[PDB]
Amino acid sequence: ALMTWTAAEFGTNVGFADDQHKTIFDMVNKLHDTAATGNRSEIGKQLDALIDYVVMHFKSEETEMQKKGYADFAAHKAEHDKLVGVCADLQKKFHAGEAEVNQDTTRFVRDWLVNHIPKVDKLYGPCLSA
């Protein structure tokens, strides 16, 4: 629902990355649907699953970038690390009962992804596909 992956918009020419992006999009979509309900326990389970996967995806990209000497690795990692800090803060507040997760939360994640993948991830394609 919320997100649709296509190669034209988001293809990196890096198979593992494209596959992990498609999983992220599916997990955002699930959270997005659940976030229109009051099922707070289900929201939390899906939130935590999504964030765990996103962090793992970032680690996967970072390991490959740094092992190959990719030119823009440190700046790219910095973008990841700011998102992880926002996500961790959201988890802390959500799991304390101090903030809610709603469809603005999933639209923010969508916004971040739809900018980051074409403008930041695509740039590693020549290096990581070589």
Annotated binding-site residues for Fe cation read: 21, 57, 61, 76, 80, 116, 121
- Among the listed ranges 36-44, 65-73, 100-108, 119-127, the one in contact with Fe ion (CB under 5 A) is 119-127
DSSP state of 120: I
> Can you give the length of the chain in residues?
130
Cβ proximity to Fe ion: between 22 and 40 the closer is: 22
The residue from 95, 121, 129, 130 that contacts Fe ion (CB under 5 A) is 121
128 interacts with Fe ion by CB under 5 A: no
Q: Write the binding mask 50 to 89 for Fe ion: x where contact by CB under 5 A, - elsewhere.
A: -----------x----------------------------
- Residue numbers belonging to the annotated binding site: 21, 57, 61, 76, 80, 116, 121
Q: How far apart are CA 100 and CA 10, in angstroms?
A: 30
- Judge contact between 58 and 84, C-beta under 8 A: yes
Q: How far apart are CA 105 and CA 46, in angstroms?
A: 13
Q: How far apart are CA 57 and CA 116, in angstroms?
A: 13
